[PDB]
Design a protein around this ligand. Sequence first.
Ligand SMILES: *Cc1cc2c(cc1C)nc1c(=O)[nH]c(=O)nc-1n2C[C@H](O)[C@H](O)[C@H](O)COP(=O)(O)OP(=O)(O)OC[C@H]1O[C@@H](n2cnc3c(N)ncnc32)[C@H](O)[C@@H]1O
Ligand SMILES: OC[C@@H](O)[C@@H](O)[C@H](O)[C@@H](O)CO
Ligand SMILES: [Cl-]
Length: 415
Amino acid sequence: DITVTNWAGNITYTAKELLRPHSLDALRALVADSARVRVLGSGHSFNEIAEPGDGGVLLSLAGLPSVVDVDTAARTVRVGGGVRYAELARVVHARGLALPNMASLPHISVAGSVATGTHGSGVGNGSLASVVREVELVTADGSTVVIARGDERFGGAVTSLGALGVVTSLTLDLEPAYEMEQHVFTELPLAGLDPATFETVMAAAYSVSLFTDWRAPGFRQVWLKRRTDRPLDGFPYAAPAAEKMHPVPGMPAVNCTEQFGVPGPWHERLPHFRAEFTPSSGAELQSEYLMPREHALAALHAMDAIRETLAPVLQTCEIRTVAADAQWLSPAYGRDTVAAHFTWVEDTAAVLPVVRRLEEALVPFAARPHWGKVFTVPAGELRALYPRLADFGALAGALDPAGKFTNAFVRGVLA
Ligand SMILES: *Cc1cc2c(cc1C)nc1c(=O)[nH]c(=O)nc-1n2C[C@H](O)[C@H](O)[C@H](O)COP(=O)(O)OP(=O)(O)OC[C@H]1O[C@@H](n2cnc3c(N)ncnc32)[C@H](O)[C@@H]1O
Ligand SMILES: OC[C@@H](O)[C@@H](O)[C@H](O)[C@@H](O)CO
Ligand SMILES: [Cl-]
């Protein structure tokens, strides 16, 4: 017996072994011979999404080769589902190519990241799932099904909560390698941050994040990640940082990607954390809520008005933008989006009442929770938030009629 947990350690899985097949032949046979299956990627979810239930099989792709195969003429890369972004990015950069975005920390599986709606920031930048052009699935009976952009099912095939089968490979679209500079600023007030000024701030560079502790009024930090092949206007709205910064006040800035406007390659500037920073776990919980971009300032004012409730259990809050997603279950489905992320203290009993209060404040803004993070939004409210959820339920019924890949988390959503 071994104990398998998620990365933060707040979720302990029921599985007494983590199965790690060493060939596709073994993987197909294992899937075909198991009654219920969920896949474990890198465990950077915070809820029971990967839990297969008692007697369910928890399987990993860590025992298969981590393939990264770039076609330079086509500007595409075929990558194993268990490959993490840090390796993917190093490889494609060495071939002269690049991705349009990355999440805050690169040591996360590509298949697991796209499964839940993972994104970075920037008003013109889609989710990480949006560059995927093809997925290859091992389905419930062990057979392989390939689904590509243009297929009428493709909208449900990438961000699928792992509910269609085991993604063994994915193919992503790439662009030429590009250089970036990161400029940090401190103390951006919320007072006077009107709709025009908010839009200007969030569009001031290729990717922009705001950070706050919800203590003193306003925002503690603003991070501008600029492409050197694009203009950068003066940024008058907050003071330039005097020191290297960490998004969480009091944590080690050495861990973070280079600042002070020093040019470097895309994959060493899009993440907030440098590749050398390799935590095996973290003492944190996370939540994030994704809303129509037009509700940004109203939502920020709702949070400000309850900030004394948020602050005591908060490490940092990060505000980002995401372009509309074509994936039916993406929290960014169908609409340009503002995202409000919370990295909490790891105290489940103190955090849940605060999450409930936060969700109540955000209800009129059609807030969709990040599938990989902590939320308490009831299932019926969830279904009402996704116009194409029925299309998804139909696709899952077609590819997995016995619900082999549906666990209690997925079942609750679809019910
Ligand atoms: C821990 C963490 C999380 C995180 C982050 C930084 C850290 C330190 N930064 C993020 C960010 O900047 N933006 C964002 O949107 N999310 C961010 N996160 C969250 C994280 O990216 C997601 O929670 C992600 O889904 C985690 O992926 P991971 O692979 O680590 O997680 P998992 O629990 O094991 O799996 C999640 C789901 O995906 C399914 N899965 C995984 N592999 C497969 C394959 N090969 N086939 C089918 N399904 C797969 C799992 O079953 C589960 O449903
Ligand atoms: O979506 C996760 C979020 O991006 C998180 O990684 C913060 O950036 C981090 O906790 C700040 O330290
Ligand atoms: Cl203010």
